[PDB]
Automatic annotation (TrEMBL), chain D:
Transmembrane segments: none
Compartments where found: Virion; Host nucleus
Tagged with keyword Cytoplasm: no
Quaternary data: Homotrimer. Interacts with hexon protein; this interaction tethers the hexons together. Self-interacts with adjacent proteins. Interacts with kinesin light chain KLC1; this interaction leads to capsid disruption at the nuclear pore complex during virus entry into host cell.
GO biological process terms, semicolon-separated: symbiont entry into host cell
Record's note on what induces expression: Expressed in the intermediate phase of the viral replicative cycle.
UniProt GO cellular component terms: host cell nucleus; viral capsid, decoration
Keyword flag Coiled coil: yes
Molecular-function GO terms, alphabetical: hexon binding
Assigned protein family: Belongs to the adenoviridae hexon-interlacing protein family.
Organism, scientific name: Human adenovirus F serotype 41
Protein name: Hexon-interlacing protein
Note: This protein is only encoded by mastadenoviruses, and may therefore play a role in mammals tropism.
Keywords, in A-Z order: Capsid decoration protein, Capsid protein, Coiled coil, Host nucleus, Host-virus interaction, Virion, Virus entry into host cell
Amino acid sequence: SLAPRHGSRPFM
Amino acid sequence: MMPQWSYMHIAGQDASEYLSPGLVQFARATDTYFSLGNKFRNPTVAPTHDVTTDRSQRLTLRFVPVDREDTAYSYKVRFTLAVGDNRVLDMASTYFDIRGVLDRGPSFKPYSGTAYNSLAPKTAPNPCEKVRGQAPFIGTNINKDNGIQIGTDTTNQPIYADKTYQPEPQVGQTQWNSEVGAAQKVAGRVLKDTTPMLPCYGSYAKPTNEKGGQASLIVNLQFFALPSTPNEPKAVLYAENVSIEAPDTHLVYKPDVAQGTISSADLLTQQAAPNRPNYIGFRDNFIGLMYYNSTGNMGVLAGQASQLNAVVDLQDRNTELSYQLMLDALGDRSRYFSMWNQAVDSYDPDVRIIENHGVEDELPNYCFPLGGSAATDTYSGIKANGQTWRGAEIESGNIFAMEINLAANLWRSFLYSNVALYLPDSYKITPDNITLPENKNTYAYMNGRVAVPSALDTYVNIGARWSPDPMDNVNPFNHHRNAGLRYRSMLLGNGRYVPFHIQVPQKFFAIKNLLLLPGSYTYEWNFRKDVNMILQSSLGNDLRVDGASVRFDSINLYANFFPMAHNTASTLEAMLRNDTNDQSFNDYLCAANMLYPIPSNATSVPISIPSRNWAAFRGWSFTRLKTKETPSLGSGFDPYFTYSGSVPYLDGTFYLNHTFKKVSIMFDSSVSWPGNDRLLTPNEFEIKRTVDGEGYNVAQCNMTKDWFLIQMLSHYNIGYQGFYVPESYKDRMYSFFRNFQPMSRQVVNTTTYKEYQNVTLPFQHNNSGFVGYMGPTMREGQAYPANYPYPLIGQTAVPSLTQKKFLCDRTMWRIPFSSNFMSMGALTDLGQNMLYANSAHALDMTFEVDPMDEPTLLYVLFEVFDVVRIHQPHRGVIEAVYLRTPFSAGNATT
Amino acid sequence: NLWRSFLYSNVALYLPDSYKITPDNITLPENKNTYAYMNGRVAVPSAL
Amino acid sequence: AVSFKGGVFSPYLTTRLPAWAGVRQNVMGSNVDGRPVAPANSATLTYATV
């Protein structure tokens, strides 16, 4: 995840 | 608290929180094999204060309409939903209360067999009348009249009335035998020549007396006589112009009715049967009772001042099917409720995929006489010349009997009742001599039409998973096996005039579970009074024609406040009053609705969307519908909706979404959107590719290994890492895999077996002579082998060419807009892409379809955000913002 | 009737061949694994 | 009862030929060796392998 809620891989 | 409590950890300290830290360490260490967490109580205490008000407020509320209105086909009610102050209502609890009277029409019959003479030999005379019939009772004299003597204190005779020969009494009380000996008295009730002579099945005859007599306005003792001996009255049959009826029975061989009025003559040969069963109960989740998705009769929910509506509905968000999906993704659906009528539709998986595995008979199944020996031969004496013994009649040889094939015959009955009658009307024949109604929809006709066992009787697709192709495209849930309908029409009872005390929920998304704030709110909604569009039937017969009615009595809103202590309720008020604290909802299905009429029988259908932004598009989902069963809910009424069964439009049902051969997409003229080539067919979404040299068909079915990578990759998000069966917590009832179904058999070749014939269906001969020729008739056959099913097995098997389908129902195809077709987020990766977020695109995209002669219309969705934000600035004012990012419901032009 | 057929149809018939009996006057292949032999044997319902 | 008996058959707008197999004609088609097929009929919605 991340903090703008869900996702995956634009964060290493 | 009180020390005695903390001593026992009733309300003291947490389990691990009082024990010495060493022991907590120990238990936390060795817990997998030696657990000690179950040996010390950990107290649990509810909040002491400021959680529930003490100021004597209601726990549930009663709301009665301020004003009502009755239309010939609808019902309008306006409520006054006024929540108090320092209290909060969650609209989820709110639910309408409905009372009235409902008439299910003559098409109702919540059973399959027959309640009358239920067990007799379904083909033979209620003793009729000239004479012909029978007598059970025995006597010692028959009087000048008076009757036959039942006998008593130096006298006693019987009552032409009922204590006559009560049709079910007997000499029976003899048994193995009885033998009307020269008792000179047979006797019994024979119907009279003014009463229709229906078969002996069905025969009802309203009781007329009390003792259970049967007459009309009182019956006369005739006096048939001897056995060609002489005047010597021997029999006194009692004759009883009954009022014969037959509710529940449709004949199936009325011999040529001599004329148009033989109520008697020789019709002692009429067969008869049960009537097909139709249960007729209210739609699942009461689908359709309230006016959803119809802009004309839309509801309202606005503060008592500023009546500006706050619920604005469209024709694209299909809020019924959306709700029905929501139950699935947030429930089980295999758990009948009774209040929301939450009984999901369903088809017996042994009825759409009928596996004619064969009969399990290996043993003769016999029928031995009633005593164990009949047709004995009197013998006497011995070759020692007759010592102390015309008597002692020992039956010779071996017992006399006659066998039945129970296992096979029961299976045949199942097949005929379950996957024979529901063939499309084309294959179904009409009885020999019975008239039928002109209309093709009324229950009178389609019940009168009778199937034929010759089409499907233990010699079709033998021992191979295969839905009879004629039944492949017909609705499966219009079926007496429909568990949901089965229960739901089981619930309201049986018969006519069924008063109903129903409760309906709120299915609209922006109102489904909105949290209301103090202030009085007006709340009116419109109810469909149209019988056909609110009640389900197992035959899909038109209801408002043959007879039906739903009269509403009273409609009351019902809500359950949470008795929150006002001390905290006020904080929650002023706290949800904040701008940033605003609520927000979304429709579950969350996608537009686009019907597309297909020509009655056509091969393909293209569609087009003029240039339009797709900022937050997510993917397309579609299916097929049969236009006869999709209501255009853009008007308060639809006189052309004659179909009554399940409606795939908004009832979750889908049963044709396998007839698509394949689909193509293309952006504005030529930009196909599988994409920069990815799929095995770089431009054609393939779903039913029928011939292979490439071997692209996946399962042993006739799918394609790109479609079964596009499905089961957006539904269960599996793929790219091995196709493993998905766990049931992500496989819901309306999911893909749950319903996928391949199958195959072999059919005799047409170019190899040079003895190949084309012996039709009325010229077969198998199991011939122990069945009826054409229909559910009777047994006038013969015996000579057979010759329908060309053996595809054993030593003399013929050649064989294969066939395969992929029956997949109750699921919609999905083509997610994501780049890799993965569930990487509700708002897709490619959806937010720069190219689609700055420059709109038109769309051209077309489908295949197996030609169905019955007119059918497409069904396509665009998986569009349907968000909503609901704010309440002041006590009694509600403000809402609706939105649809790729398919906005309003723009600068309005 | 139906229950008896079920018992012989499924449990009274898979007995080892030593319990099954060949029919009165028909011939069977000498190989014990071929279908013609396997079905040729017929079980006695009284046993099950 | 609608008879396009006085119109220039083509009022309705036309779309690109789908450009895939199958739907461009409905006359009996021939297989590599000669075994024919059905153009737009049933028995073409089943995986008739050999």
